[PDB]
Design an enzyme around this catalytic site. Structure first.
Site, PDB file in Angstrom:
ATOM      1  N   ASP A  35      22.270  88.244  84.131  1.00 41.55           N
ATOM      2  CA  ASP A  35      22.580  86.845  84.424  1.00 41.55           C
ATOM      3  C   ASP A  35      21.321  85.992  84.374  1.00 41.55           C
ATOM      4  O   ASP A  35      20.559  85.951  85.350  1.00 41.55           O
ATOM      5  CB  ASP A  35      23.233  86.732  85.795  1.00 41.55           C
ATOM      6  CG  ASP A  35      23.613  85.302  86.144  1.00 41.55           C
ATOM      7  OD1 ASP A  35      23.592  84.433  85.240  1.00 41.55           O
ATOM      8  OD2 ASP A  35      23.935  85.037  87.334  1.00 41.55           O
ATOM      9  N   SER A 199      19.070  70.337  74.167  1.00 43.75           N
ATOM     10  CA  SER A 199      19.643  70.361  72.829  1.00 43.75           C
ATOM     11  C   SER A 199      19.523  68.984  72.179  1.00 43.75           C
ATOM     12  O   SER A 199      19.563  67.949  72.846  1.00 43.75           O
ATOM     13  CB  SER A 199      21.111  70.782  72.905  1.00 43.75           C
ATOM     14  OG  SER A 199      21.747  70.672  71.646  1.00 43.75           O
TER      15      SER A 199
END
Length: 330
Positions: A35, A199
């Site tokens: 994770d 992004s």
């Protein structure tokens, strides 16, 4: 040193991935959920409330000759999906794919919430975010990667998750045969303890690319792709019959649909998520309404590049003095 381990989807939907981990002496092998959005290595154990164990493999520290109680240390964590767990702490030897750390903090669950009990395939979590998020008190503990870093050939790990198939976590090296083209690296902020990056934009299907900054986290422990409501609306508007359902808890679409791809930007590069990766199947057994793999982050407070996005790429978690993230097509 290096390590290399195969990671395997827990079910036919890729709801999560499990990776075998050796703990203690002699080794006890548990299948953990790696994770990159949390920083605790915790396991079902011989200390877990018996009624909260339903098929998981447990760590028994009393059978490990290298286990030592970390006196006074406790832990307690709550995840973004509402699940939680808590307990006490041992140090022990932990190996992943041939890479060994001695003295790793292994957090032994005394209590786990229902969603953990109900998932017999996940024996615990291995956190790979930054150690500043680790919950152990009163002395915060380091992640497996943080403890291994100095010994690794290169201070990196990579995630290569499969679509409906096994994939690989590598530590200490970049497998240049595992991706196509080049790896594009992008800056990371560690201020929230995550692998947080920006992004450069998105496209829906064959549509034109929209240049827009989207700050979010690379999170292998989250199944879906969570993005701003504007982006998610633009995606689902291209699917006839798709709608946001408050009663189901997100966007659903007719199971008869063919989904468009979704592209996200990494600097000047582009990662394409095929439409099939966005299908999470019937909302309930036998339903013709299917659950979408791209969902709004509006209720979270952060955008999350979960498995839906990461499985479309070869992803480098670069733990150099100034961390960065790398993405390649594959």
């Amino acid at each position: 040193s290096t390590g290399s381990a195969t990671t395997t989807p827990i079910d036919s939907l890729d709801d999560a991935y499990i990776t075998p981990v050796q703990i203690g002496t002699p080794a006890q092998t548990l299948n953990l959920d790696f994770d990159t959005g949390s920083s605790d290595l915790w396991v079902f154990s011989s200390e877990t409330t018996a009624s909260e164990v339903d098929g998981q493999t447990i760590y028994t520290p009393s059978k490990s000759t290298t286990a030592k109680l970390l006196s006074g240390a406790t832990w307690s964590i709550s995840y973004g999906d509402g699940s939680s767990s808590s307990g006490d702490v041992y140090t022990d030897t932990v190996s992943v794919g041939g890479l060994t750390v001695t003295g790793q903090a292994v957090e032994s669950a005394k209590k786990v919430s229902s969603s953990f009990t109900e998932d017999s395939t996940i024996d615990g979590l291995l956190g790979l975010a930054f150690s500043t998020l680790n919950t152990v008190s009163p002395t915060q503990q380091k992640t497996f990667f943080d403890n291994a870093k100095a010994s690794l050939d290169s201070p990196v790990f990579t995630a290569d998750l499969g679509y409906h198939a096994p994939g690989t976590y590598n530590f200490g090296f970049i497998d240049t045969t595992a991706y196509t083209g080049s790896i594009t690296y992008t800056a990371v902020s560690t201020k929230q303890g995550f692998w947080e990056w920006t992004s450069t934009g998105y496209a829906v299907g064959s549509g034109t690319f929209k240049s827009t900054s989207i700050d979010g986290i690379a999170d292998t422990g989250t199944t879906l792709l969570y993005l701003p409501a504007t982006v998610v609306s633009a995606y689902w508007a291209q699917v006839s019959g798709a709608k946001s359902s408050s009663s189901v808890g997100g966007y659903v679409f007719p199971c008869s649909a063919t989904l468009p791809s979704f592209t996200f930007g990494v600097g000047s590069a582009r990662i394409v998520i095929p439409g099939d990766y966005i299908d999470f199947g019937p909302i309930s057994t036998g339903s013709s309404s299917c659950f979408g793999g791209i969902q709004s982050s509006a209720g979270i407070g952060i955008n999350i590049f979960g498995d839906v996005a990461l499985k479309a790429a070869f992803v480098v978690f670069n733990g150099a003095t100034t961390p960065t993230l790398g993405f390649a097509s594959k």
